[PDB]
Design a protein around this ligand. Sequence first.
Ligand SMILES: Nc1ncnc2c1ncn2[C@@H]1O[C@H](COP(=O)(O)OP(=O)(O)OP(=O)(O)O)[C@@H](O)[C@H]1O
Ligand SMILES: Nc1ncnc2c1ncn2[C@@H]1O[C@H](COP(=O)(O)OP(=O)(O)O)[C@@H](O)[C@H]1O
Ligand SMILES: [Mg+2]
Lengths: 247, 247
Amino acid sequence: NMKERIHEYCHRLHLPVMAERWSAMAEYASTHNISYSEFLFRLLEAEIVEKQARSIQTLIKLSKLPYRKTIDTFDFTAQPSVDERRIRELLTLSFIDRKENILFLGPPGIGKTHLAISIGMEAIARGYKTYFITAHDLVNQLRRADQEGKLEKKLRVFVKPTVLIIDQMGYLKLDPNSAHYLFQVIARRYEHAPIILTSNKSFGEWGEIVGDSVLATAMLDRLLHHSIIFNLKGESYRLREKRLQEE
Amino acid sequence: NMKERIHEYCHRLHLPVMAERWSAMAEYASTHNISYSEFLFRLLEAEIVEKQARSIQTLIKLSKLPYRKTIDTFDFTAQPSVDERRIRELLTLSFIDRKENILFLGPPGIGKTHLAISIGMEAIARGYKTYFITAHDLVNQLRRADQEGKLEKKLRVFVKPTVLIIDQMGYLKLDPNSAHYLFQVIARRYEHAPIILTSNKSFGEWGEIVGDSVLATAMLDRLLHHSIIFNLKGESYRLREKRLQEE
DNA sequence: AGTTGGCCGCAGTGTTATCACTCATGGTTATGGCAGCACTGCATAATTCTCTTACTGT
Ligand SMILES: Nc1ncnc2c1ncn2[C@@H]1O[C@H](COP(=O)(O)OP(=O)(O)OP(=O)(O)O)[C@@H](O)[C@H]1O
Ligand SMILES: Nc1ncnc2c1ncn2[C@@H]1O[C@H](COP(=O)(O)OP(=O)(O)O)[C@@H](O)[C@H]1O
Ligand SMILES: [Mg+2]
């Protein structure tokens, strides 16, 4: 017949959702006499919707972001120190065009990691590749790669992502070898793609964190050449939620 | 014949209890006209019960508890400051789903480790894995593993168990540089599995014990977010309670 | 009569001087292969579970 061949060809072209909604839209046109152009537009637009939904799901899976949290889930009133203007301007992704390294600083529990993850979710929803990693894990993987001789591979894997996120930078101390391993990534991404970083220590302490003042200075210079910092302060939201649960 | 073949097949299928009791079960089903399905169900249920008993035995063996205790041997009249009902509620193991952390704080000998091990035993009974360790011991083992280079193995060993019983947090103080191991364990188990902590040092002394203020602050911020803290006020049972009640 | 050794004769090798040829490098243009990314499958290694074994002293 004809329907079977249509379905088979759609599957061979990998457009099954198109075929399904194509029957629905064919019925719709039979009911309202839609032009062939608009009909095909419905088919292809819905196929695009499904394909991009699946692609964004698999991309979030590709990225190691801990959770799929959106800015909508966040409250600004509980954190007076932040301003919606700057956060939403970052959400506009102008930094990607300008290649600005976003940095978050402040004591624990403020929510800097939450905001960074939300920004990453927006970036990965808009097609841009994203990759999440912790400083300690990044350094460990780089050292193992250097040991195995595949250092270039991991360096590419950490540099290729359009938006690289480094988290928990400062709580754990780093040795000079780790300092140079981090410096390699920083240099490769000096002016090629933005870096989103979160930390609790001031810039000066990075010398003690990395075990070398000069390496810390160089990395800070390269990171801050094009950067927008967010020095946030306030009460730990974990503690406040615990208090609310108590009451 | 058939009896010997049945015994051999039960042993080859790893059904020892079934091999032992199949004759008696057959006789009982004979004398009561039990259906074949119910006969099979009886055999399988007995085998399952015995297997679960042996599994619980193995889990309690691997728990590495110093000894075995339960709430049965606990007197709440000697500890009237804290509510009895809350501990009974904990015995329902509702905290395992919520991933909340259970903290016992009080003077030495007031029964902290007793209650912690009792709750761990209740968790082991219902199949949940549990690992008992002393905080300083855990940090030392993690340091040795890191020196040997295979740190991730021990980290998984400590993070995988559903219930972690970290005791004697303040008893001993290792080199402050090793507190990052404790932070790693607490953060990796954060929002994943409960932690049972028991110690006699206030929350302010953590910076001194670990030799780092911000590190201890972050550890507590994560360990106290989802938790139920019990503060035990009293005197050393073994000496003071007997001395004051024999009068 | 046969085999080996010595002598003679013939051929091959070494050094010096000279000649010839081939290979390498530089510049420009074109083509092919390899590398990178994404998805799927298999195998190996590591981890977990269960049972048995080992060590020391009474
Ligand atoms: N203003 C807020 N409104 C709602 N949730 C908040 C707010 N601030 C923080 N949180 C919540 O606090 C939790 C922890 O946030 P986050 O991990 O970003 O903290 P942090 O300060 O970066 O921590 P650390 O220094 O330990 O890495 C998240 O669940 C986030 O949702
Ligand atoms: N409320 C109590 N009821 C029964 N026994 C108790 C109680 N408190 C303490 N004990 C006894 O004391 C010991 C527990 O002390 P523990 O809490 O381990 O002290 P620490 O926490 O300093 O190690 C156990 O042997 C237990 O039998
Ligand atoms: Mg964070």
